[PDB]
C-alpha cells in the first residue's frame, strides 16, 4: 500500500487552498497541496473584475470602512449569510490586499489629478488629491456605492494566484498536481485524509494528515452553460458529501452572470455595461429601459439577468443553432474607448467570437457563474466531520447567503485562506490522530476495486451522453427562473440519470492516464451534487437572492429564514437528505429588511425581525449618545471571533 503523510493536507490549488497552505507551512507544519492541474491554472486565474476591500484610498472610496462593506454584503445576501462570518471577512479583506501588495501583486495605483470617469448619475470628472497618489486604486464594480474593488489592470485573479503560488514555492510547500482526491478517509466522525488517484499513473494512494482542508472551487460545470473552467465539476463537494457525515449548504444557491459570450461562456466583464454598454434584442431594440425605466442597463446584475430571460420568453430573442440569445453593443462607446479601457474584451470577441466589438455586436446570454453553496462549516471553517475544513468557493462559510457581491469571492478565497488557515493550523498542531492501517487499507482497497469495476463494466450506457443530458436538465430547469412542476421533473430525471451512470461502459481499459475512466467516476459524483442543487431548489418554496421561484415570488422570512443542509447518510439512497439550520435573528447585527434591488415589500416580514430592529435602534441610540465609537457599538450588537493574528484594526488614509 502507498501512503503519504503530512501534518496538513490541502485539496485544491486555487487562491483559498494555496493561501491556507501558506498559513500552515509557515508555522512548521508539513503541508501538501493536491491539485488536478498545475495550481497557477486554477479558475481563480480568470478573475478580471477585481477584489473587494474597504481601503478607502481613492476619491470614490473616501469614507469607506468595514461597516459599509459589511452592510453591502449582508443586504446583498438577502439575509441568508452568517453575519458574524461576514464581519470576520470585511475586517480582514483590507489586510489581505496589503499582504498581497507586500508579496508583489502589482495593484493599479492612484495618480494625482483629474480623471475621465463614468458615474452614470453625473459622469463628470474625478479628482485624486496628492496625498492619495501611489496608494492602491479601486473601481466601480459589484454595484456598491463606495468604489472598493481593487485590481491589477485586467488580470487580477491571475496576479493574485501567481503571488500566492510563488509564496508556497518559497516556503517549500509540497505541490503535487495531476492528483485527484476521489474519497475522504474517515472513522468515528473524524477525517484522517483522502484517497487519491494519480491521474498520470493511475496509482491509488492514501494521503493521511492530522487535518484536511477542501478548497476545490465551485460546481458550475453541472450546468451546460457556465463561465467556469472545465475542471469546476464539484468533485470536492461530492467527496465530502459521500462521507455521509459532512453536510452541504445552500446548494440551490447558484449565481448567474448576465453577459457571458454565447455560447462559449467566455466572460465579458461587467465593465461593458458599467461603461455604457447596451443590450439589444433580435430587432436591435434597446430593451432594458422598457423594464427598468430608471436604472436601465445599469440595474442590479440580478435584475438584468432576469429581464434578459423575460425578454427572450416574450419571443424577442435571437435564434441560433446553439439556442436563443441577445446582443451586447459596446461599439457605441467608441473605438478609441474600447482600445484603451476595454482592450481585453476586444481581444476576447475577436479571438473567440471572431468579431470586433467596436463594429459588431456580441452574442450574450446569462449563464451559471458562482457557487454560493458548498461544504457547510462553522466560523472556523470546520465541517461536521471533525478535522475536515473547507474554504473558498467550495465552502458555505456563508458570508454570501443567497447572493454574493461581485468582487467578494476572490476576496473571500484569500481571506478564508488566511482565517480558516490559522484555525486549520491550530487544529493540525494541537490534535492527535489515531491512524489505523485497517481503515486506510479499507478505503484504498475500496477505490482500487471501484476503478477495476469501472474498467470491467459490461454496461452499455455512454458516460458523455449521460453527462451532457445532466447539463441540459440543469440549464433548462434549475436556472434563473424556477417552478415546482419543472423542478419535480428535473429531480426525477436526474435520479434516473444517476442510476444509469452505474451502467456505464468504457472503451479504454488502461488504469493510467485515462480520460474516459476519469469521466466514469466523476459523472456519478456530479449527479449527486446536481441532485442536492435541484432537490434543494424544489423544496425551498420562496424566492431569495439568486433563487427565484415563479410559483413562490416572495422572500419568506417566516418559514425560510434558514440554510439548506444536504447530506447522503445512506449510500443506498438515491436522493439527498435535506435538513434546515435556522438563522437566529437575535444574533444579527442587521435585522432582515429590504435588500435594495428588486420590488419592494416582496418579502413576508417576520415578527422577530421587528423586535430585533427596535432592539438595535435602541442600543445604537444609547451608545451613540454616550459618545461611543462605531467599534464599541458593533461589539454590543454582535460580537464575532477572529484569530489573534488578525484582530488588529485597519489603518486608513484619514485617521
Amino acid at each position: 500500500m502507498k501512503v503519504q503523510y503530512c501534518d496538513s493536507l490541502v485539496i485544491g490549488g486555487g487562491l483559498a487552498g494555496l493561501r491556507a497552505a501558506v498559513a500552515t507551512q509557515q508555522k512548521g507544519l508539513s503541508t501538501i497541496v493536491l491539485s488536478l492541474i498545475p495550481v497557477k491554472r486554477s479558475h481563480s486565474a480568470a478573475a478580471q473584475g477585481g477584489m473587494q476591500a474597504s481601503l478607502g484610498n481613492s476619491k470614490m472610496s473616501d469614507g469607506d470602512n468595514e461597516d459599509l462593506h459589511f452592510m453591502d454584503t449582508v443586504k446583498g445576501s438577502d439575509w441568508g449569510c452568517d453575519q458574524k462570518v461576514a464581519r470576520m471577512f470585511v475586517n480582514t479583506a483590507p489586510k489581505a490586499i496589503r499582504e498581497l501588495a507586500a508579496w508583489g501583486v502589482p495593484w493599479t495605483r492612484i495618480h494625482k489629478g483629474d480623471r475621465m470617469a463614468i458615474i452614470n448619475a453625473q459622469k463628470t470628472t474625478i479628482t485624486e488629491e496628492d496625498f492619495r497618489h501611489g496608494l492602491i486604486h479601486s473601481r466601480d464594480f459589484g454595484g456598491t456605492k463606495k468604489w472598493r474593488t481593487c485590481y491589477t489592470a485586467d488580470a487580477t485573479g491571475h496576479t493574485m494566484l501567481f503571488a500566492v503560488a510563488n509564496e508556497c514555492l518559497k516556503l517549500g510547500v509540497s505541490i503535487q498536481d495531476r492528483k485527484e482526491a476521489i474519497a475522504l478517509i474517515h472513522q468515528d466522525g473524524k477525517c484522517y485524509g483522502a484517497v487519491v488517484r494519480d491521474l498520470v499513473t493511475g496509482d491509488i494512494i492514501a494521503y493521511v494528515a492530522k487535518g484536511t482542508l477542501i478548497a476545490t472551487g465551485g460546481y458550475g460545470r453541472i450546468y451546460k452553460n457556465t463561465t467556469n473552467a472545465v475542471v469546476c465539476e464539484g468533485t470536492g463537494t461530492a467527496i465530502a458529501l459521500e462521507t455521509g457525515i459532512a453536510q452541504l449548504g445552500n446548494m440551490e444557491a447558484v449565481q448567474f452572470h448576465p453577459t457571458p459570450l454565447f455560447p462559449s461562456g467566455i466572460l465579458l466583464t461587467e465593465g461593458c455595461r458599467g461603461d455604457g454598454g447596451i443590450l439589444r434584442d433580435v430587432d436591435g431594440h434597446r430593451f432594458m429601459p422598457d423594464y427598468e425605466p430608471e436604472k436601465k442597463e445599469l440595474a442590479s446584475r440580478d435584475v438584468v439577468s432576469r429581464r434578459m430571460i423575460e425578454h427572450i420568453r416574450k419571443g424577442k430573442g435571437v435564434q441560433s443553432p446553439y439556442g436563443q440569445h441577445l446582443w451586447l453593443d459596446i461599439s457605441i462607446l467608441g473605438r478609441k474607448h474600447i482600445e484603451t479601457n476595454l482592450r481585453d474584451v476586444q481581444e476576447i470577441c475577436e479571438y473567440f467570437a471572431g468579431i470586433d466589438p467596436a463594429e459588431k455586436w456580441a452574442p450574450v446570454l446569462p449563464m451559471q457563474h458562482y457557487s454560493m453553496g458548498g461544504i457547510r462549516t462553522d466560523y472556523r471553517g470546520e465541517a461536521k466531520l471533525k478535522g475536515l475544513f473547507s474554504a473558498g468557493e467550495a465552502a458555505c462559510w456563508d458570508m454570501h447567503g443567497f447572493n454574493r457581491l461581485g468582487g467578494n469571492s476572490v476576496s473571500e478565497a484569500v481571506v478564508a485562506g488566511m482565517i480558516v488557515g490559522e484555525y486549520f493550523a491550530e487544529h493540525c498542531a494541537n490534535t492527535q490522530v489515531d491512524l489505523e492501517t485497517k481503515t486506510l487499507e479499507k478505503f484504498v482497497k475500496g477505490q482500487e476495486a471501484y476503478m477495476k469495476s469501472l474498467v470491467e463494466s459490461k454496461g452499455t450506457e455512454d458516460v458523455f451522453k449521460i453527462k451532457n443530458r445532466m447539463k441540459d436538465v440543469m440549464d433548462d430547469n434549475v436556472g434563473i427562473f424556477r417552478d415546482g412542476p419543472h423542478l419535480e421533473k428535473a429531480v426525477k430525471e436526474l435520479e434516473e440519470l444517476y442510476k444509469k451512470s452505474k451502467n456505464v461502459g468504457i472503451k479504454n481499459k488502461r488504469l493510467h492516464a485515462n480520460p474516459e475512466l476519469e469521466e466514469a467516476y466523476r459523472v456519478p459524483m456530479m449527479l449527486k451534487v446536481a441532485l442536492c442543487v435541484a432537490k434543494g431548489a424544489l423544496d425551498r418554496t420562496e424566492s431569495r437572492g439568486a433563487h427565484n421561484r415563479e410559483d413562490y415570488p416572495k422572500r419568506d422570512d417566516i418559514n425560510w429564514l434558514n440554510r439548506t443542509l444536504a447530506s447522503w447518510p445512506n449510500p443506498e439512497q438515491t436522493l439527498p437528505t435535506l435538513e434546515y439550520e435556522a438563522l437566529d435573528v437575535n444574533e444579527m447585527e442587521i435585522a432582515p429588511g429590504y435588500r435594495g434591488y428588486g420590488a419592494k415589500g416582496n418579502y413576508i416580514e417576520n415578527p422577530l425581525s421587528v423586535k430585533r430592529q427596535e432592539e438595535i435602534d435602541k442600543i445604537q441610540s444609547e451608545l451613540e449618545a454616550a459618545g461611543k465609537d462605531r467599534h464599541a457599538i458593533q461589539e454590543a450588537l454582535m460580537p464575532y471571533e477572529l484569530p489573534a493574528k488578525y484582530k488588529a484594526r485597519n489603518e486608513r488614509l484619514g485617521d
Binding site: 507586500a102 508583489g104 502589482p106 501611489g134 491589477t152 514555492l169 498536481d177 492516464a513
Partner: protein
C-alpha cells in the same frame, strides 16, 4: 455544409509497452467560430475517448492548452480552424517538456522548477505591517511590473526555443522574463549581483542565442526581445 477538416494528431503512450509513436487522422466538419478546443472535445466524446490533452479555462488565460499547431506552439483554445486555408491541421504536443501522453505534457512541474530556480518571489528583509497603509508605488512602475507579470506559464516560448530543445538546462525565455519582472519591482531588494548568481551562466542568460521565436509566439505578447537584451547588458556588466 462547413467543409471537412482533416485533423492529424500525434499519439503515443510512453507508459504502455505496446504503444508506438504515430499520427491518427480524424474527419471533422467545421462549424462557425470553431476552435481546436471544440474540435478536440468533439473527437473525445464522439470518435476517440483515448486521446489525451489538457484544457482548463478555454479562454486563453490559464496557459494549459499549448501545443504545436501546424508547426507553431499556440494556445489551442484560442486557435480557430477558419484560419487554416487548406483544412488540414496537424497537432503535436509541445516539445521540450516531458511527454505524458499524446498531446499532454508536463509544463506545470517544469515551471515550478524554474520558479524555484530563479527564486520567483519578493525578497525583502522586513515584512510590511498588513494593518497599516501599503507602501506607495508610482503608477507607471506598477504598470511596468504588471506587463511582465502577465506571463501565464503556457510554455509556448519554451517549446518554440531551438536552444532549449537542444540544451535542456537552458532556463528559457520565461525564466529570463521572470528575473526581469522582479528586477524592476521596487519591493524586491535583490541587486544585479544577486541575479547573476541565479542566471549568470551558460544555462542562463548567456545561453540565449537570440532566435527570438519566443517573442514571436508569446500569446500574451510580452516584450521578450527587449527585456532579455536588457538583462544581457546588465549581467555582462557585473563585477
Amino acid at each position: 455544409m462547413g467543409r471537412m477538416l482533416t485533423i492529424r494528431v500525434f499519439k503515443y503512450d510512453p507508459q504502455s509497452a505496446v504503444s508506438k509513436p504515430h499520427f491518427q487522422e480524424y474527419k471533422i466538419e467545421e462549424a462557425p467560430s470553431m476552435t481546436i478546443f471544440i474540435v478536440l472535445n468533439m473527437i473525445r466524446e464522439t470518435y476517440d475517448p483515448d486521446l489525451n490533452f489538457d484544457f482548463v479555462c478555454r479562454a486563453g488565460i490559464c496557459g494549459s492548452c499549448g501545443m504545436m499547431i501546424n508547426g507553431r506552439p499556440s494556445l489551442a483554445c484560442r486557435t480557430l480552424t477558419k484560419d487554416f486555408e487548406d483544412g488540414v491541421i496537424t497537432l503535436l504536443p509541445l516539445p521540450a517538456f516531458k511527454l505524458i501522453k499524446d498531446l499532454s505534457v508536463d509544463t506545470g512541474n517544469w515551471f515550478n522548477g524554474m520558479s524555484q530556480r530563479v527564486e520567483s518571489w519578493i525578497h525583502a528583509q522586513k515584512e510590511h505591517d498588513i494593518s497599516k497603509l501599503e507602501e506607495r508605488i508610482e503608477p507607471e512602475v506598477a504598470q511596468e511590473v504588471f506587463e511582465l507579470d502577465r506571463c501565464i506559464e503556457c510554455g509556448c516560448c519554451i517549446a518554440a526555443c531551438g536552444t532549449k530543445i537542444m540544451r535542456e538546462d537552458f532556463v528559457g525565455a520565461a525564466g529570463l522574463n521572470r528575473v526581469v519582472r522582479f528586477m524592476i519591482d521596487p519591493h524586491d531588494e535583490r541587486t544585479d549581483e544577486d541575479y547573476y548568481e541565479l542566471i549568470g551562466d551558460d544555462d542562463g542568460v548567456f545561453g540565449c542565442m537570440t532566435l527570438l521565436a519566443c517573442h514571436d509566439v508569446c500569446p500574451k505578447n510580452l516584450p521578450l526581445q527587449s527585456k532579455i537584451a536588457y538583462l544581457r547588458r546588465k549581467m555582462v556588466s557585473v563585477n
